Amino acid sequence: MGPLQYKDLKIDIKTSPPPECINDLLQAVDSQEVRDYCEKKGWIVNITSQVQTERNINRA
Amino acid sequence: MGPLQYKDLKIDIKTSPPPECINDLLQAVDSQEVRDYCEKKGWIVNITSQVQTERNINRA
């Protein structure tokens, strides 16, 4: 199977969350509303495996 | 008046919080525990217009 091109990153300004300011933050105040928010914002502070992009490239 | 004798403000030190990732974050999930944490961490994310709710509560 295959969800997407599944390979190196190819974006830039849109969905972080590499600048772990929320998780490094909320990793101490227990508050998924802040991370649920962060990933609501668009960082996704949580993991770097299951990602979903809206601008596919297979066709572009 | 102010919170105290607020003076000397032309450096930066390890205390941010200009990178408003917590406040820009927590400004939407209502969670002073994250900012109380952020300023506990050392950013101090907190606008200074006319707030006077005796911050720095006794969390220890």
DSSP state of A35: H
- Pick from B28, B30, B38: which is nearest to A25 by CB? B38
The CA distance from B37 to B25, in Å, is 13
User: What region, left, alpha or beta, does residue B19 occupy, with left being phi > 0 and alpha being psi -120 to 50 degrees?
Assistant: beta
The number of distinct structural domains making up chain A is: 1
- Pick from B19, B21, B29: which is nearest to A31 by CB? B29
How far off is chain B from A58, nearest CA to CA, in Å? 33
Instruction: Report CA-CA distances (Å) from A23 to A40, A46, B9, B37, B46.
Output: 13, 7, 28, 12, 19
CATH number for position B9 = 6.10.20.20
Give the count of beta carbons closer than 10 Å to the beta carbon of residue B26.
28
Inter-chain CB proximity B31 and A34 less than 8 Å: yes
Domain containing A35: what range?
1-60
Chain A residues whose C-beta sits inside 8 Å of any chain B C-beta: 19, 21-22, 25-26, 28-31, 33-34, 36-38, 41
Closest residue of chain A to B34, computed from CA coordinates: A29
Experimental method used, please? Answer: NMR
Amino acid, res. A42: G
User: Residues with Cβ < 8 Å from A40, sequence gap 6 or more?
Assistant: none
Closest residue of chain B to A34, computed from CA coordinates: B29
Chain B residues whose C-beta sits inside 8 Å of any chain A C-beta: 19, 21-22, 25-26, 28-31, 33-34, 36-38, 41
Instruction: Report CA-CA distances (Å) from B54 to A49, A51, A59, B2, B33.
Output: 43, 42, 57, 11, 15
